[PDB]
Amino acid sequence: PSEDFVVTDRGGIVENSHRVHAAVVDAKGRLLYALGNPTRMTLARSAAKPAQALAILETEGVAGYGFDDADIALMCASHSSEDRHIARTRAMLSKIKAEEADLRCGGHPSLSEMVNRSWIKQDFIPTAVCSNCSGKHVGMLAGARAIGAGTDGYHLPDHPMQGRVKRTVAELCDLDAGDVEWGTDGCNLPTPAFPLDRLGRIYAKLASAADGSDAGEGQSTRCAALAHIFRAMARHPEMVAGEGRYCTMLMRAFDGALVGKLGADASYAIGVRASDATRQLGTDGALGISVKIEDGNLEMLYAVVTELLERLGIGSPDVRSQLASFHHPQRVNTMGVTTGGVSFPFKLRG
Amino acid sequence: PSEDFVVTDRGGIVENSHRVHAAVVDAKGRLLYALGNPTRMTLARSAAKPAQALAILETEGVAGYGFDDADIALMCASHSSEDRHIARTRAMLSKIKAEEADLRCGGHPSLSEMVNRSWIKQDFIPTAVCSNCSGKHVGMLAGARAIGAGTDGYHLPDHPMQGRVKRTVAELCDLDAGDVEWGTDGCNLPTPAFPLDRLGRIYAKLASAADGSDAGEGQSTRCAALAHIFRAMARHPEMVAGEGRYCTMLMRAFDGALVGKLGADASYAIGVRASDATRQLGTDGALGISVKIEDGNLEMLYAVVTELLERLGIGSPDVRSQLASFHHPQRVNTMGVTTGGVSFPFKLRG
Ligand SMILES: [Cl-]
Ligand SMILES: [Cl-]
Ligand SMILES: [Zn+2]
Ligand SMILES: [Zn+2]
């Protein structure tokens, strides 16, 4: 096993170390570069959301509801529960003539510290419509209604909408059904685990489909839907997360060049459209990147992802400088004295 | 290296893993049991506070201020900034005729989520007296005043109070000064790093001194002062942390049998008075335990510390059941469904 870490120090003394796994794959999922164990069996959590959104958009009759790009971005989101996210959740429920009572996700403290502060000040108790997964849940309800299935149990593994999700995830991974494992997520849906490189493969396919669409290529409905998902996330990155969130700041900085998505417990995935940077890495098409911090630390994840983009030459120093607060998180004490820092002793292997 | 972990799962699928280091030592610091690397160079952080409190109590003239056992417990604390902790800090300042403006620590968000919620609701900005380390800082200012040193720089390495702390830490560890490294803490004081087993040694000495005092044994001034610290922490565990906090609940459950203390970034130390349990582990005196979670996760620390007490046979099932919420942390989703749990794939080696 490779020994790839992100390390924090206090005065040069090692504080914490965090094991890093990463895969960099081409449009077919061939491994180009790695850290740690690039095939680590990994719970993709929210980083699987574009695959779930594909299952929703491929459900017959869902096109009739008129979901727009911002709605699809919300299906792909771990949003901050800003008022605009709650409003768009309600808009999507109304498009399918459903009610908040039909949701089978629950409320939680906001993924944004500033939103949660406003909630605490107002004694607000979040409900189902506030879930960071609310857009995905409305999409699943939409799919269940569109094919005339029951809506009560849309979130249960035996429901046809979850059969569609399970098949679609395995297909995008190029895995047999038996090679994808399933548990239950915080939002009470089935959630997949598969080798980490296949999360990179999903995002390589998203970016590859975006390149194919832009070139005016004849596309299957699946490739057209993957291109639409890429475009929706890149055009509405504030729907995918929210103000001050890594994913939103990353996708705004890159202005269409890539899409990026967090998974709970510190997974990350990026789909990179073909560029001078991807060609310099030795591939003639789109690229996927997937990362897992073994111990689940989110601060370390954002620092590593930003360091990996710098090492891969993705963006420019000016584009990546928008992410400086995440790349090198502050280690300043209560008296304004810098006491430590973050370092990246890992080495990409080709 | 041994492969000692604490793991979380979702439906039996590995979520996060965390490397565990631990030392179990006798009263002289002989290693009895280990996990991971028992000599890992480790920043003790707040787990060093009993050693710093010894340096304060061994400063000539500090006895004249009339600090009581709850004040000494506050010197040993990472408190939750409850109103009782803030009031006692200001009472301690009054005993030494010093003011909040003399403190060289700063305010921070409360270590208690429930306290921090109350602060957010009231727009409260914490100040120096709110520091979780405020009791240690007042004790250092007390020492500086008692010997007629300057107070302005009590926190600087060249100050006699820091010279006394540095010597006292090396003496309790039985280390040469050059084998203790120093950084700067969150509270803006020097903070020591030394091999993890020597943190266990400090706490074995605390508990050994408590045994000597209780048995009416003639004691050195250092052993009497260590026994006083042990008694203060065990009698006033709400000063050491606060309501709902692991350290307070642990020390209340054990009712004088042990003291325990958190260090930031997931170190922990316990001093165990001689008992049927310590004799069964193969020592005729007190025991020390020290733990570090490599990646710094606190939830995992409290789970591992509680698991270690069970494995070592310290306490009884009834005493340890008070800590069941920490031992086996809840993994319940937003809809009340249990999605996973914590497991302890580590093996104590003798
Ligand atoms: Cl949220
Ligand atoms: Cl700090
Ligand atoms: Zn979800
Ligand atoms: Zn401190």
Half-sphere exposure of B48 (CA within 13 A, CB side): 31
CB atoms within 10 A of CB A231: 20
Q: What is the CA radius of gyration of chain B?
A: 20
User: What resolution does the deposited structure have, in angstroms?
Assistant: 1.4
From CA B309, how far away is CA B305, in angstroms rounded?
A: 6
d(CA A42, CA A169) in angstroms, rounded, equals: 14
Determine the distance in angstroms separating the CA of A190 from the nearest CA of chain B, rounded to an integer. 10
- Identify the DSSP state of B349: B
Whether A334 maps to a domain, the answer reads no
| Closest ligand to residue B136's CA | 4
Burial letters A159-169, b for 16+ CB under 10 A, else e:
bebbebbbebb
Contact A125, A118 (CB under 8 A): no
Q: Which of B105, B106, B294 sits opposite A17 (nearest CB)?
A: B294
A187: chain B residues, CB-CB within 8 Å: 333-334
Q: How far is Cα A262 from Cα A288, in angstroms, rounded to an integer?
A: 14
Which two tokens mark A121? 């000040």
Residues ≥6 apart with Cβ < 8 Å to B174 = B29, B198, B201
How are beta strands B258-263 and A181-184 bridged, if at all? unpaired
- In chain B, residues with a C-beta closer than 8 Å to the C-beta of A191 are 10
What distance in Å separates the CA atoms of residue B5 and residue B2, rounded to the nearest whole number?
10
Confirm whether A338 is domain-assigned. Answer: no
- End-to-end CA distance of chain B, in Å? 15
Say if A51 falls within a structural domain.
yes
**Cα–Cα distance, A12 to B316 (Å, whole number):** 42
Domain that holds residue B68: 23-334
Query: Does the annotation flag A173 for ligand binding?
Result: no
Phi, psi dihedrals of residue A156, rounded to the nearest 5°: -85, 145
Pairwise CA distance, residues A115 & A113, whole Å:
6
User: Would you say B187 is a known binding-site residue?
Assistant: yes
Distance CA B43, CA B158 (A): 21
- Answer whether B334 sits within 8 Å of A186, measured CB to CB: yes
Q: How many CB pairs under 8 A join A and B?
A: 127
> Under DSSP, is residue B15 helix (H, G, I), strand (E, B) or coil?
strand
Strand partners, B288: B25, B271
The CA distance from B21 to the nearest CA of chain A, in Å, is 12
Contact present, B242 and B80 (Cβ < 8 Å): yes
CA A135 to chain centre: 13
Question: What's the CA gap between A117 and B229, in Å, rounded?
Answer: 38
How many domains does chain A fold into?
Answer: 1
- 3-state secondary structure string across chain A: CCCCEEEEEECCEEEEEEEEEEEEEECCCCEEEEECCCCCEEECHHHHHHHHHHHHHCCCCHHHHCCCHHHHHHHCCCCCCCHHHHHHHHHHHHHCCCCHHHCCCCCCCCCCHHHHHHHHHHCCCCCHHHCCCHHHHHHHHHHHHHCCCCCCCCCCCCCHHHHHHHHHHHHHHCCCHHHCEEEECCCCCEEEEEEHHHHHHHHHHHHHHHHHHHCCCCCCHHHHHHHHHHHHHHHCHHHHCCCCCHHHHHHHHHCCCEEEEEECCCEEEEEECCCHHHHHCCCCCCEEEEEEECCCCHHHHHHHHHHHHHHHCCCCHHHHHHHHHHHCCCCECCCCCECEEEECCCCCEC
Query: Measured between alpha carbons, how far is B118 from A295 in angstroms, rounded to an integer?
Result: 31
Considering the domain boundaries, does residue B3 fall inside one?
A: no
Asked if residue A156 belongs to a domain, the reply is: yes
Relative to beta strand A5-10, strand A13-26 is: antiparallel
- Phi, psi for B220 (deg, rounded to 5): -55, 160
Joined together, the tokens standing for residue A125 give: 């108790």
User: Could you give the dihedral angle defined by the CA atoms of residues B212, B213, B217 and B223, in that order, rounded to the nearest 10 degrees?
Assistant: 70
The residue among A103, A293, A335 with the most chain B CBs within 10 A of its CB, best to mutate, is: A335
Strand partners, B261: B269
- Calculate how close chain A gets to B170, using CA atoms only, in Å: 17
Residue B262 lies in a domain: yes
Å from CA of B235 to ligand 1 middle: 42
Decide if A16 is inside a domain: no
What's the CATH number where B227 sits? 3.40.710
Residues of B with CB under 8 A from a CB of A: 8, 10-18, 41, 43, 104-108, 117, 120-121, 131, 181-188, 191, 193, 265-266, 294-297, 333-337, 339-340
Annotated ligand binding at B223? The verdict is no
Distance B229 CA to ligand 1 centre (A): 44
**Cβ neighbours of B10 in A, within 8 Å:** 43, 183-185, 191, 193
What's the per-residue H, E or C state across B79-141? CCCCHHHHHHHHHHHHHCCCCHHHCCCCCCCCCCHHHHHHHHHHCCCCCHHHCCCHHHHHHHH
CB A159 within 8 Å of CB A104:
no
- Asked if B290 and B269 touch (Cβ cutoff 8 Å), the reply is yes
- Residues of chain A with Cβ-Cβ distance to B192 below 8 Å are none
CA B16 to chain centre: 26
CA distance linking residue B127 with residue B108, whole number of Å: 8
Here the tokens at position B132 are 């979780």
Report if residue B258 sits inside a domain: yes
Q: What span, in angstroms and rounded, lies between the C-alpha atoms of B350 and A69?
A: 61
Residues B24/B258, Cβ–Cβ less than 8 Å: no
**C-alpha–C-alpha distance, residues B292 and B196, integer Å:** 8
CA distance A144 to A156: 11
Residues of B in contact with A106 (CB under 8 A): 333-336
Solved with: X-ray
User: What's the rounded Cα separation, in Å, for the pair B313 and B24?
Assistant: 13
Structure tokens at B149: 């040193």
For residue B39, what is the DSSP state? T
